[PDB]
Design a binder for this molecule. Structure first.
Ligand SMILES: *[C@@H]1O[C@H](CO)[C@@H](O[C@@H]2O[C@H](CO)[C@@H](O[C@@H]3O[C@H](CO)[C@@H](O)[C@H](O)[C@@H]3O)[C@H](O)[C@H]2NC(C)=O)[C@H](O)[C@H]1NC(C)=O
Ligand SMILES: *[C@@H]1O[C@H](CO)[C@@H](O[C@@H]2O[C@H](CO)[C@@H](O[C@@H]3O[C@H](CO)[C@@H](O)[C@H](O)[C@@H]3O)[C@H](O)[C@H]2NC(C)=O)[C@H](O)[C@H]1NC(C)=O
Ligand SMILES: *[C@@H]1O[C@H](CO)[C@@H](O[C@@H]2O[C@H](CO)[C@@H](O[C@@H]3O[C@H](CO)[C@@H](O)[C@H](O)[C@@H]3O)[C@H](O)[C@H]2NC(C)=O)[C@H](O)[C@H]1NC(C)=O
Ligand SMILES: *[C@@H]1O[C@H](CO)[C@@H](O[C@@H]2O[C@H](CO)[C@@H](O[C@@H]3O[C@H](CO)[C@@H](O)[C@H](O)[C@@H]3O)[C@H](O)[C@H]2NC(C)=O)[C@H](O)[C@H]1NC(C)=O
Ligand SMILES: *[C@@H]1O[C@H](CO)[C@@H](O[C@@H]2O[C@H](CO)[C@@H](O[C@@H]3O[C@H](CO)[C@@H](O)[C@H](O)[C@@H]3O)[C@H](O)[C@H]2NC(C)=O)[C@H](O)[C@H]1NC(C)=O
Lengths: 345, 345, 345, 345, 345
């Protein structure tokens, strides 16, 4: 029979000389560790901090020949997660953690099973707040590439090597969605081998190609800033010569743009370059700034003979018949050159 | 007599070979674990994060025949919560925790009693910050369905199965209320069995049908945005022909709507679809945007013969006698089609 | 002599069979635990969360006859707080903790002394963030009743009963004050016995009758909203007939009320009922909304014969001589009915 | 020789009967503990919470005759900070901690040396978030007195007494500065002996006299509120009789004061009394509120004979020649009485 | 052979008398500890708190002759990071931590190797939130010098001395960048030896010369405040004599500057001195405040004979022909003196 109480201690403890402080295949080749991650929760992709919180099941597989068993009849032993403090485990860390933690609610969220030949499957639940540097040039239409790279902190490349396994290195939960992005399906899997003045260390990362749902920004930034571009066109059809209302209408619209432009970047890092939403909020700040300046020409020109008196006002109304149509052709010639530049990535 | 000092150690320790690393009924059927939760505190249902904090008493019951006792005369042993580190306990976890913790103030908030036949009751106090993806299409009248699902992380479906017990799987505190929602009474109880590339794992979740108290939004969003819809009607009865006040009144009301519309979504996630409060705050942004545009017609028309001079102004006042009544019929024909669409779920 | 080194171990350890896993008077009556709390720090009474942080010295007293000593000559043993992990201690918890923690700076902040007859005094320092549901109907003049109830999580009512002691169950620090409230002196002390499907459990709570310092709100909400009620009275004495200023003055005052009304509830939960500060900020939103509407009558009436021309304007100035005095009598007849309703609780 | 390996264990362990659970001089006089603190970091003096974070080196000295050594030749033993779990240590705590923690980065930040006669020096690094109730009557010119008091939680006054040592009880880091305050040099050192219903307990506190750098408030509150007091003087020199601009200029300035007054207390607790910055922001709210009201007199008076027509307007311009100079004498007679009241503490 | 299981215990444990509580070279010279840091993550350089979060690999090297081995054939032993609790380690701490923590995700992020002669390499991953006092005189063009100094808390200068090693004391990650600053390449390395009343303690710090990316501030503060400086120039070309629009245009521009000036310092500490962005936001607050005051002269002068009537208005238009060009020469003579003062550091 060989009950399971004795078999457990006969594999880890003083008998058989298992020493969890000494890696497998000592004084031999490296310990080929194949990895893959399941993603439960993805999101909270902040940009004030330029990080993102993920929740994964880190699986790992290596081969420890000291963990070989033939006395037992079946082909696997999913064991107590309290066993994990007794076997060797690779010292994987996330080279851009910025804060990570296990989960220990009602039990350690850990798994451990050991095939007959000695293979190990070590799945643990982790929450990471990974650091990815956002490139925000073409901001509302950007395609971020946030990474997560799994280094080794203490074993060099000739003692512990990581790998992704061939059959589906990165799964995703069945209905996993994001509030603002959409995780594209192709997930890169490339090496990131590290060299320090201590030596070289195994590294393997997995690129995630995020992508913004532009829909939210077509409802708060673009449309609400395309109306005020139209109110600045209201300052033309009124009285045809002059009034304090045109200056009033002009001054107010320039007020909203200044306030609305500031609120546009209210929740972004203070990057030192001009991003895509800036030139929009800058061009719409001209066509409002031009109307209030356009009136300054006519009212100045109007307050400036026997027969030239009638033609004198034609010097002004000839403007308002051009400005009233010159603007809505330039804003539409710009607005088509804009979206073709960013929808062409 | 058999005092309780000796009886405790005679059930757990080296005698009798209890091994807390090996589940009950080893090499046999699964371990049928029946669960139910008491809910002390429910609330803080955030939406910037799309999660909610709960505070529950997780009860559990299974059957461990090794914990059977006949030497003792009474029918239960509510034991020391320090005992829990010595018996088998299922590795239940909350598949969408997003952060959970026990409570250990003045003692571990844990319970443990063991009937004669071997049944176990294991009640622990937990605080969870569970993740539920909010569907915010019809926002102020939405009916969220936030879940909480109790998986098993290390034992497969042929070694540990969960269940809800038939008699009241989900109680609630006696006077439990919510600040913004109302927890409906019917609580779904369905299976959520999981398949990974490690195997299959037992899962059972409990749907909670939340529902917004719409009263708060009929005091800050709808009513305060129904007044400014009326001030935009003030721009009609004044002077009957033209004045800088009508442009002034019109410009200001459009200012409030833009600011108030932005503040409407000041505390929501940046979802990429149009929600119910948006089309209201958009339609009320037209009827203000139309009045300021409506004046642009009359003032343009007025500043445009022997007998046609009197009828010429009738070309304008015929407008203001229609606009002054055409608007308050369209806003009321829309406002009835709106609330019938959302009160019909 | 019997030095204190040997006497300590002779009371707890293997000798005498003290078993901290087994309550006093086993198989007998319950363990009458008398409690009382000293309050160091009270405050941070939030309402976005509807909780409050307290800092207390929880004292407890029971009787453990196994802790009786006659070899020692003196009448008390204030002992090492490291002793507390060795004696029985009731598993008191705070049924609405929402987060609590001990203090362990320079030592565990714990006390322990043991009279000769076996009494125990167990004082520990705790920080609690207790949950009290705020009732905010009459908001700036409300009288909250936040509680704190001390249940037992694992022992049923026939094995552990709590009580408040008769001589001053709830002290308070000598000069303890609050930033916004004033802790009234009478502190209720009533039972809160709990019944679950596990059994019944001892409970005893202590009501604290908070009460708002209304002074802060008579400086930011009421007075700053009583001036703008007066500026809306400025729109009467100017020009006696009409001007764009009256519409200008009216429009601006309605702007401030809308903005100021929103800021009034800027730091409150989104309760689904109308609170006391709302009807004030609503009534003051009418008397501003009426002036801007009051001008719409006169200016409409004025722009509407041989002898009736002079009496025609009297149709308007008869208004402004009434509105200029009708308002400051209604606002004062309302303002007296308001404060009598809320100062009468 | 007597190497240091054996000498350490010969002082703490089973030999010599050192019992860290029993204070020095048992059954004798109290244990005179002399204290002093070095202050590394001081600041983050919040007022929404009314607390302040400090970072100190708590030194302590007492006399434990059991720690006397003559076998060793030198006059001190700066020992391993892992030793501290083995000797007696007074249970000092900070009676207004509100949250404190050790530092354990690269080692416990702890010190321990033991002179020959038995003296002990026990220096530990601590971060405290101490609670000091702010008195904000004369707010921008206030002089806070935040304290920190070092009580004993478990030993009564006849078993453990604290003291400050005579030679410099409170040092400060060499270039320690504060962002908003300036820590005055005199630091009070007085007793705070406590009496509870458990007994009396040793206490000694150290007052810190903070003091605000008023410079920041002479750049955002006072100067920016002294300009708008001047724009309200702009409403006099324009047109000498009346215009919609004066009402426009008046209405806008009253707008800024209301908004700016609210922003003045944007980051303060909701205290129930009138603070110094309030009467300034209230008096400047009158001189703007008076100009807009001052125009209401003239414009009302102007729109009210054969020879009295010319003198009739003199009834108005006599005002504007007084108001244009009466104001800038009252604002300067108030502004001198103000600063003499608060610069005289 | 001498397998690695026995060799490990033969170096640390009871054999050979290694005592981790006693430094190397006891009763001899100090323990020369050479340090260097690798910087993974740098950033979150806050200023409300005046701190910055870093993420480093602290390496250390000393010489412990008790850790000498000749039985083993190879020249290094990268060992289990669980070994670190058994060897001597210097008690380095960061004298301005303000909060630090190790990383323990999937293993302690620690390294340990031991050359044959006894050298030790001890690399650990750390996250620090270091305190650097910001000097914000010339704010958007400032050059901060944030430090990090590595003291010894318990060993005096005659028992433990730190040093930087000569070959590259401070590396940086390969593509490390910052959101707002740029870490200059020269990194100072100077001593900071400390003297307390406990003795003297080894200290060595490393200055980091940060430097602001001024680009962000040329897009939100300077340019958006250079437009409104131009709108205040719009108040000249309109009507050449007077209008309510000029007062309207003037009043509004002064509004934006006041609001925009406040928002300029919306995210900075309340420093008690005038910083560089203040005099810009103050000078631009004059040229707007002068235009609204400039109109007060002309409109006052205009409303003030047979032949002097025509020359009387020339007394006013002579102004507007000077003010319309006097301003854009002073703003450009100031604007060149400004940037030469701050680009000259
Ligand atoms: C872990 O994975 C590595 C790489 O996949 C394995 O290294 C490879 O080991 C094989 C033998 O097992 C080597 O083949 C031998 O190479 C020599 C040249 O040195 C050549 O004469 C023959 O082809 C011979 O078979 C192979 O070179 C070597 N490759 C590398 C890149 O190291 C390693 O064996 C794996 N270890 C375990 C425990 O699985
Ligand atoms: C835990 O619960 C499961 C499901 O309720 C139990 O499994 C059931 O066990 C019974 C016997 O105890 C099985 O009945 C037997 O089924 C065979 C077909 O395999 C049929 O010839 C007879 O009806 C026979 O009685 C039943 O099939 C089986 N059902 C399932 C779905 O597994 C299990 O016994 C419970 N274990 C414990 C320890 O309570
Ligand atoms: C803890 O407190 C409870 C309640 O104060 C005590 O219970 C009381 O115990 C007394 C005896 O000690 C009981 O008196 C006896 O009652 C019977 C009826 O059952 C009657 O024939 C006599 O009056 C007799 O003296 C009393 O009934 C009982 N009351 C309750 C409510 O339980 C308990 O003894 C205390 N235990 C300790 C260890 O202090
Ligand atoms: C700790 O400090 C306290 C106070 O500084 C010390 O108490 C003092 O102890 C001395 C003797 O060591 C006492 O002197 C004796 O007083 C009696 C009156 O009771 C009088 O007849 C003589 O003057 C005699 O010398 C002194 O009164 C006493 N004072 C107080 C306030 O307690 C204590 O000895 C110190 N303990 C240690 C271990 O240093
Ligand atoms: C740790 O580093 C310090 C400083 O680099 C070393 O101290 C130096 O030790 C050498 C001998 O090893 C001393 O040389 C001797 O100095 C005497 C004067 O006292 C002079 O007669 C000779 O030049 C003699 O060689 C040197 O003075 C001394 N310097 C200092 C500043 O202490 C120390 O030896 C190093 N310890 C280890 C374990 O590496």
């Amino acid at each position: 029979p060989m009950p399971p109480s004795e078999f457990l201690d006969k594999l880890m403890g003083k008998v058989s000389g298992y020493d969890a402080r000494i890696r497998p295949n000592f004084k031999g080749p490296p310990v080929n560790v194949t990895c893959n991650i399941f993603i439960n929760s993805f999101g909270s992709i902040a940009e004030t901090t330029m990080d993102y919180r993920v929740n994964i099941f880190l699986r790992q597989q290596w081969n420890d020949p000291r963990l070989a068993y033939s006395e037992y009849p079946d082909d696997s032993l999913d064991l107590d997660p309290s066993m994990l403090d007794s076997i060797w485990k690779p010292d994987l860390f996330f080279a851009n953690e910025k804060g990570a933690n296990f989960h220990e609610v009602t039990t350690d969220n850990k798994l451990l099973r050991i095939s007959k030949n000695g293979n190990v499957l070590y799945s643990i639940r982790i929450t990471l707040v990974l650091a990815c540097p956002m490139d925000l040039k073409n901001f509302p239409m950007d395609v971020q590439t946030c990474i997560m790279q799994l280094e080794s902190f203490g074993y060099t490349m000739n003692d512990l090597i990581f790998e992704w396994d061939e059959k589906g290195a990165v799964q995703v939960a069945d209905g996993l969605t994001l509030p603002q992005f959409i995780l594209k399906e192709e997930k890169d899997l490339r090496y990131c081998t590290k060299h320090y003045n201590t030596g070289k260390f195994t590294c393997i990362e997995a690129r995630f190609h995020l992508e913004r749902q532009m829909g939210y920004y077509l409802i708060q930034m673009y449309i609400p800033s395309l109306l005020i571009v139209i109110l600045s066109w209201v300052s033309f059809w009124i009285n045809m010569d002059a009034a304090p209302a045109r200056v009033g209408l002009g001054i107010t619209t320039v007020l909203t743009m200044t306030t609305q432009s500031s609120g546009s970047r209210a929740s972004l890092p203070k990057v030192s370059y001009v991003k895509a939403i800036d030139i929009w909020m800058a061009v719409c700040l001209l066509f409002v700034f031009s109307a209030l300046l356009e009136y300054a020409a006519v009212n100045f020109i109007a307050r400036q003979v026997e027969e030239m008196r009638k033609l004198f006002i034609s010097r002004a109304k000839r403007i308002d018949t051009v400005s009233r149509v010159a603007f809505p052709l330039v804003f539409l010639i710009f607005n088509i050159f804009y979206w073709i530049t960013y929808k062409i990535i």
